[PDB]
Amino acid sequence: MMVISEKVRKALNDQLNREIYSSYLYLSMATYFDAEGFKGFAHWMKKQAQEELTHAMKFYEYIYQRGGRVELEAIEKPPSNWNGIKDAFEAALKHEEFVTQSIYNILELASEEKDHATVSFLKWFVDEQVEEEDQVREILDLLEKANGQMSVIFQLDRYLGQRE
Amino acid sequence: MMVISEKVRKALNDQLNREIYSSYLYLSMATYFDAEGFKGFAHWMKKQAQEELTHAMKFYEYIYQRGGRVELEAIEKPPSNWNGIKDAFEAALKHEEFVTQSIYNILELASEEKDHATVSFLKWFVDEQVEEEDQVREILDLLEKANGQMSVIFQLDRYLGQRE
Amino acid sequence: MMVISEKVRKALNDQLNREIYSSYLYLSMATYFDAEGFKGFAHWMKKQAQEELTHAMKFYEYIYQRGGRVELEAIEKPPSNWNGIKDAFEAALKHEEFVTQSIYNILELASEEKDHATVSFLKWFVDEQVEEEDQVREILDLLEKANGQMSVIFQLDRYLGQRE
Amino acid sequence: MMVISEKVRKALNDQLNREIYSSYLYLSMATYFDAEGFKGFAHWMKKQAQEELTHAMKFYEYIYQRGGRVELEAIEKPPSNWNGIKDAFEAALKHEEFVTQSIYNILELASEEKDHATVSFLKWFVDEQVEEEDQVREILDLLEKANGQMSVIFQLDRYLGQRE
Amino acid sequence: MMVISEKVRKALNDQLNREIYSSYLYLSMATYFDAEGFKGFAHWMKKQAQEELTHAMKFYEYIYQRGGRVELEAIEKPPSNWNGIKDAFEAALKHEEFVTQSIYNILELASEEKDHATVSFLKWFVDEQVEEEDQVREILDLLEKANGQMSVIFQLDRYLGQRE
Amino acid sequence: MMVISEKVRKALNDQLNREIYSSYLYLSMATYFDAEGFKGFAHWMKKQAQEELTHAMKFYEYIYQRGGRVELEAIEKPPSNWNGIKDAFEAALKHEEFVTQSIYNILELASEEKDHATVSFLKWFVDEQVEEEDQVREILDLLEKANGQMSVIFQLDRYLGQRE
Numbered sequence: 001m002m003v004i005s006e007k008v009r010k011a012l013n014d015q016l017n018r019e020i021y022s023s024y025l026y027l028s029m030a031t032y033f034d035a036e037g038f039k040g041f042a043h044w045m046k047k048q049a050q051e052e053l054t055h056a057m058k059f060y061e062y063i064y065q066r067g068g069r070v071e072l073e074a075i076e077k078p079p080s081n082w083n084g085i086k087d088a089f090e091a092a093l094k095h096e097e098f099v100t101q102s103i104y105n106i107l108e109l110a111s112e113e114k115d116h117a118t119v120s121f122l123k124w125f126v127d128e129q130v131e132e133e134d135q136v137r138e139i140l141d142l143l144e145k146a147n148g149q150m151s152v153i154f155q156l157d158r159y160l161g162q163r164e
Numbered sequence: 165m166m167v168i169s170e171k172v173r174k175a176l177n178d179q180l181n182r183e184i185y186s187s188y189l190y191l192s193m194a195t196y197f198d199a200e201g202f203k204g205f206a207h208w209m210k211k212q213a214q215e216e217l218t219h220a221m222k223f224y225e226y227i228y229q230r231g232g233r234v235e236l237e238a239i240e241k242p243p244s245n246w247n248g249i250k251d252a253f254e255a256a257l258k259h260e261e262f263v264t265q266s267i268y269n270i271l272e273l274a275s276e277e278k279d280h281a282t283v284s285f286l287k288w289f290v291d292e293q294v295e296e297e298d299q300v301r302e303i304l305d306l307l308e309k310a311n312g313q314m315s316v317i318f319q320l321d322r323y324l325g326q327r328e
Numbered sequence: 329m330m331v332i333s334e335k336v337r338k339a340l341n342d343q344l345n346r347e348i349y350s351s352y353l354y355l356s357m358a359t360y361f362d363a364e365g366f367k368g369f370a371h372w373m374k375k376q377a378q379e380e381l382t383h384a385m386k387f388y389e390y391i392y393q394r395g396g397r398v399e400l401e402a403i404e405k406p407p408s409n410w411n412g413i414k415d416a417f418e419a420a421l422k423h424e425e426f427v428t429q430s431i432y433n434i435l436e437l438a439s440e441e442k443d444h445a446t447v448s449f450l451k452w453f454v455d456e457q458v459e460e461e462d463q464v465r466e467i468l469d470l471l472e473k474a475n476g477q478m479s480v481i482f483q484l485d486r487y488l489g490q491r492e
Numbered sequence: 493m494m495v496i497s498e499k500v501r502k503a504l505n506d507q508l509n510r511e512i513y514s515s516y517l518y519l520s521m522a523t524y525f526d527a528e529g530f531k532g533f534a535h536w537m538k539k540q541a542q543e544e545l546t547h548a549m550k551f552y553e554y555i556y557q558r559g560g561r562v563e564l565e566a567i568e569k570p571p572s573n574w575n576g577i578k579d580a581f582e583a584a585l586k587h588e589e590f591v592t593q594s595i596y597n598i599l600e601l602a603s604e605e606k607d608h609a610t611v612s613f614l615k616w617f618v619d620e621q622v623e624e625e626d627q628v629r630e631i632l633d634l635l636e637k638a639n640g641q642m643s644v645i646f647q648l649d650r651y652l653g654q655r656e
Numbered sequence: 657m658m659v660i661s662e663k664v665r666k667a668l669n670d671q672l673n674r675e676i677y678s679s680y681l682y683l684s685m686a687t688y689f690d691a692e693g694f695k696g697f698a699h700w701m702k703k704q705a706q707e708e709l710t711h712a713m714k715f716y717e718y719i720y721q722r723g724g725r726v727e728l729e730a731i732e733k734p735p736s737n738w739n740g741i742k743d744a745f746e747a748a749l750k751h752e753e754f755v756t757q758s759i760y761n762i763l764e765l766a767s768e769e770k771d772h773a774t775v776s777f778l779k780w781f782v783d784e785q786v787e788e789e790d791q792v793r794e795i796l797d798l799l800e801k802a803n804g805q806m807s808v809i810f811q812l813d814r815y816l817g818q819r820e
Numbered sequence: 821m822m823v824i825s826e827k828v829r830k831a832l833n834d835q836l837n838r839e840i841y842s843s844y845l846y847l848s849m850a851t852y853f854d855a856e857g858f859k860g861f862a863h864w865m866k867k868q869a870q871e872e873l874t875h876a877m878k879f880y881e882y883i884y885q886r887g888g889r890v891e892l893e894a895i896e897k898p899p900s901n902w903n904g905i906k907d908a909f910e911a912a913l914k915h916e917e918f919v920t921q922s923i924y925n926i927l928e929l930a931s932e933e934k935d936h937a938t939v940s941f942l943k944w945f946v947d948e949q950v951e952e953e954d955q956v957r958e959i960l961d962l963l964e965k966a967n968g969q970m971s972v973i974f975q976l977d978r979y980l981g982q983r984e
């Protein structure tokens with residue numbers, strides 16, 4: 001039997017599908033960077049996409065751990081074009097901040113229901129979101145200091161292309 | 165400059181999006197097996213989902229190798245339920261055979277345009293499809309011999325749950 | 329269900345039986361060389377016979393991979409005598425060319441039916457036939473320069489007797 | 493000079509050709525098991541076929557050791573269908589017993605001619621036949637206890653599929 | 657005896673000589689880069705010249721494999737000078753695209769003659785050409801971003817100078 | 821600025837192009853030996869050709885070390901038919917002696933202009949030419965003793981085919 005409420009279950013399932021979209025969005029940023037010839041930035045985005053899938057799968061497994069079931073929904077078509085390298089990363093930061101607020105909404109919902117198990121499960125994503133936002137802000141700071149100079153952009157493209 | 169025709173480029177991009185859906189479909193079959201309590205079958209489908217992503221990324225990189233560009237499209241909601249283990253794998257076989265026919269269509273299109281580079285690139289997928297169909301047919305044959313016997317279904321579950 | 333046409337399955341099954349005969353013929357060339365006291369040439373022919381069996385089993389497994397079935401037919405009696413070492417290799421070359429044309433006929437039949445999976449599977453044998461024909465032409469060219477000189481035939485026998 | 497009588501050479505050469513047919517018969521049993529979807533039983537039959545070839549080559553080398561020569565004959569078409577797993581292994585047992593009696597017949601002919609070298613050479617095959625018959629009787633005994641229960645057949649298929 | 661048509665042997669021998677010129681052209685681009693003081697770009701061109709020689713030798717060995725012989729022709733004087741770093745690489749890309757179409761022409765000729773051995777042999781060069789064209793396009797894209805800035809050109813020189 | 825005289829740079833550039841032709845000539849002797857079926861002699865010529873390229877590149881790098889520039893010239897069509905094995909190696913000796921005399925002419929020109937750096941650089945080639953002439957003279961002496969005997973020519977072919 002399911003030991004999460006149907007509201008909490010739906011919120012977790014909604015977030016799972018939101019995490020799938022996050023993965024798709026970053027792949028679409030890879031398609032942009034590859035079109036612009038920045039294979040290192042594209043590689044970073046491909047790695048980021050795979051990292052979002054592991055986020056989706058940890059929502060996946062917690063739902064089944066609490067006796068729930070996952071239902072996959074349609075994934076909306078992501079943007080595919082940005083006005084420059086910085087515009088794509090600014091869009092990524094705005095998306096991660098939106099993801100953080102979506103995690104907060106589940107946390108507050110689970111808290112109102114005294115679903116302590118789900119509140120505590122979500123804390124990993126709270127801490128992880130602090131990292132994901134910080135890593136994009138750091139990239140944005142390096143792009144702002146580069147100020148469009150291709151010598152510095154090349155060094156950061158190769159650097160982000162070294163992602164593990 | 166793009167050295168594939170727009171027609172061939174669109175055929176390859178369409179197939180990339182079909183591989184994305186294929187991955188999503190197998191993940192949704194995993195959600196079905198996990199809801200039914202068959203963690204080994206669900207594990208098999210998760211491994212299958214990741215294999216489809218490598219198919220999409222192969223199309224991805226070939227498109228850019230020939231000067232094209234990838235555009236990600238919306239992904240349709242896959243089914244989430246099947247009338248049994250055999251029904252799910254029969255749906256899997258029918259989908260893989262459909263995937264093979266779609267690859268065949270790109271091959272014949274590239275062939276009539278004398279796009280030998282794309283014809284030759286597609287050979288890996290032709291050979292790979294032979295094995296994808298054969299492994300589902302083997303599973304279906306084993307499920308047919310099991311004939312609903314739970315002791316034998318349990319053997320098949322943990323066996324497929326060992327997937328590499 | 330079988331996903332090769334009955335025409336294509338019959339062509340592959342016919343070739344499987346042809347590969348069995350090719351194996352048998354080379355064993356019968358071994359019986360001739362051993363009767364003549366040339367154990368190195370005989371050893372080469374025994375290794376050649378085993379190589380043909382691996383070709384036959386490759387056809388075997390591809391047929392079942394495509395949902396077909398193998399039927400073994402009677403194997404005709406091969407010749408057991410040749411007019412010297414060079415005559416035997418002339419027969420080997422003539423046989424290998426016949427095998428190559430038989431592979432070609434399956435390839436053209438599969439291509440007419442747009443059976444791309446079988447066309448691509450047969451590529452390995454086209455390439456292998458290039459090597460097998462070349463191996464015998466090289467031996468024949470050496471025998472033509474040898475002109476029957478026993479010192480040269482002995483070293484060639486010892487060398488071919490070293491085949492792994 | 494040949495130091496076996498022609499009668500004994502013909503007996504040994506006839507048996508060599510019988511071993512070739514035995515190999516072909518077991519390969520044909522593999523085509524049956526593979527058509528029935530029992531890849532472990534099929535694997536067992538493919539290994540049995542290669543072992544029969546080593547028997548043929550043992551007769552081969554002894555014939556030449558005694559100054560005789562081997563003549564390969566036509567290989568009859570083996571049956572390709574059986575009425576079940578038990579029926580195939582029963583046919584295998586009946587064939588191995590027939591092979592044993594054929595070896596016994598050479599032994600008695602050689603001993604009548606006081607060909608002690610051939611009498612002694614055949615001792616290895618007498619002993620080998622004891623094991624070949626016993627290995628099939630053991631398989632038949634397990635199939636009789638299994639009585640068609642797929643739970644037991646699956647494990648026996650995988651077990652025989654491990655034959656080295 | 658030659659088992660390729662004389663038309664195909666001439667097409668292959670012509671392409672071998674074209675590969676020889678290709679190495680010479682790249683060596684001549686090296687002389688240009690070395691005169692301009694870019695040892696990394698020159699090093700890249702010297703590696704490219706040796707790669708073209710391995711292409712010529714592949715054609716060489718296949719011609720003899722099929723019973724033909726190679727005839728070397730005069731090598732035309734390549735251009736010595738270019739209007740800049742980008743101008744040289746644009747000429748290289750235009751040449752590689754010309755080499756690809758010449759290979760395409762041999763494939764279509766062999767295919768029309770049903771010379772499946774040569775058709776299948778040429779697939780390696782089709783695939784290699786995709787890599788050769790792409791490698792130069794990437795360099796041209798990086799040179800376009802450099803926009804003449806010596807700070808960025810020094811990065812590309814050192815980077816291309818690390819080619820193995 | 822260029823610190824070799826224009827006369828010395830041209831003499832060196834001419835010799836560079838001469839070394840390219842020597843490489844091409846030896847490749848063409850390889851085409852002859854391969855057409856005649858002597859893969860060992862052909863192997864020797866292929867190694868010699870690659871050795872001539874390192875000679876050319878040594879001239880290449882010294883020219884730029886002295887501030888000069890390399891200009892590649894047209895390469896003449898080499899001969900492709902010799903009367904026999906010994907005639908080809910006799911032509912190889914004759915060519916190397918011509919190369920040695922061409923090096924002598926540069927050395928005497930450099931010494932007259934008091935270009936001690938070029939005089940000292942050319943000593944490596946003086947000593948190297950002594951070795952290259954000597955190794956062809958040794959092969960010719962063995963071919964003269966063979967006196968056309970194919971058993972002995974085969975031994976020399978195998979021996980020269982072991983060249984590293």
Ligand SMILES: CCCCCCCCCCCCCCCCCCCC
Binds near residue numbers: 020
């Ligand atoms: C080498 C680069 C890899 C990039 C991967 C990009 C993935 C994008 C995925 C979009 C969503 C489609 C459905 C994915 C299901 C994945 C299931 C994984 C189970 C472990």
Ligand SMILES: CCCCCCCCCCCCCCCCCCCC
Binds near residue numbers: 549
């Ligand atoms: C030196 C051995 C030469 C043998 C020639 C035999 C020609 C007739 C063969 C008939 C039976 C063939 C059985 C082959 C079994 C191969 C199993 C391989 C499994 C991967």
Ligand SMILES: CCCCCCCCCCCCCCCCCCCC
Binds near residue numbers: 683705844869
């Ligand atoms: C590192 C510089 C390379 C420059 C190559 C220039 C080539 C010009 C053509 C001259 C003849 C080349 C002969 C090459 C023979 C190679 C044989 C290889 C055998 C495996």
Ligand SMILES: [Fe+3]
Binds near residue numbers: 022051055099
């Ligand atoms: Fe996330």
Ligand SMILES: [Fe+3]
Binds near residue numbers: 186215216
């Ligand atoms: Fe796929």
Ligand SMILES: [Fe+3]
Binds near residue numbers: 347380
């Ligand atoms: Fe074969």
Ligand SMILES: [Fe+3]
Binds near residue numbers: 675678708711755
């Ligand atoms: Fe090339």
Ligand SMILES: [Fe+3]
Binds near residue numbers: 871872875
């Ligand atoms: Fe030289």
